[PDB]
């Protein structure tokens, strides 16, 4: 009664957003190395038991719609849901090829009242992206 | 009988708010490298917070940035876990 119930037909869906290239107008450069990230994440989460889908170079509209539709699917037989975002970012926002979109808007689709089939189920979001420009110099 | 609509979320950020995130063009980003390595080794037997805590440690200790630009040279990074989970999470059994 202290652990999430994992006794379902499938573990769940794992959506990987792999944004590598960006429209010049965004001022964002190529994210070299993200392909090896996307792959490693794929191999790992597939091994965990997730039904993994990889999306590449998505626009903000694409990312929003993608996650919206995912939340509208039937997760009754799924133990949980996972989503991994690989892109440029700033505080509270993530880059599509087309520009920025709020991270809260992406994840809000899976709120309890907006995705009833993932209710009382863990919703995991892994985010590889900058959240500002500060750097950590370290110590000792 | 009701449950908060914001409940049962977990966010595993690669870094803390206001800060940048490091990516190695040849090896991939630090956070993903560490995440995958630990998941490969403990994905089945460890609780999700135990995993991400070890990910935090790995990124914090094993990594330090190199760059000809001194501005990005010898910098460090710590990831950021945000948990609204109500239970422990194991990916197995």
């Amino acid at each position: 009664t202290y652990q999430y119930n994992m006794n379902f037909e499938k573990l769940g869906k794992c959506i990987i957003i792999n944004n590598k290239n960006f429209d010049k107008v965004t001022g964002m450069g190529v994210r070299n190395g993200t392909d090896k990230d996307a792959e490693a994440l794929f191999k790992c989460f597939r091994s965990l038991g997730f039904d993994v889908i990889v999306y590449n170079d998505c626009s903000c509209a694409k990312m929003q719609d993608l996650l919206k539709k995912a939340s509208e699917e039937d997760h009754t037989n799924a133990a949980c849901f996972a989503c991994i975002l690989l892109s440029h970012g700033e505080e509270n926002v993530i880059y599509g090829k087309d520009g920025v979109t709020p991270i809260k808007d992406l994840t809000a689709h899976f709120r309890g009242d907006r995705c009833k089939t993932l209710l009382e189920k863990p919703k995991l979001f892994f985010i590889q992206a900058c959240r500002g420009t500060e750097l950590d110099d370290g110590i000792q | 009988y009701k449950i908060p609509v914001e409940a049962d979320f977990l966010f595993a950020y690669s870094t803390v708010p206001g800060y940048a995130s490091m990516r190695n063009p040849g090896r991939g980003s630090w956070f993903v490298q560490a995440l995958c390595s630990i998941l490969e080794e403990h994905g089945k037997d460890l609780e999700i917070m135990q995993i991400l805590t070890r990910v935090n440690d790995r990124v914090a200790r094993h990594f330090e940035s190199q760059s000809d630009d001194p501005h990005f040279h010898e910098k460090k990074q710590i990831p950021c876990v945000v948990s609204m989970l109500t239970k422990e999470l194991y990916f197995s059994q």
Binding site: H88, G89 | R23, P25, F72
Partner: peptide
């Protein structure tokens, strides 16, 4: 290394 580069930044995101």
């Amino acid at each position: 290394d580069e930044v995101x």
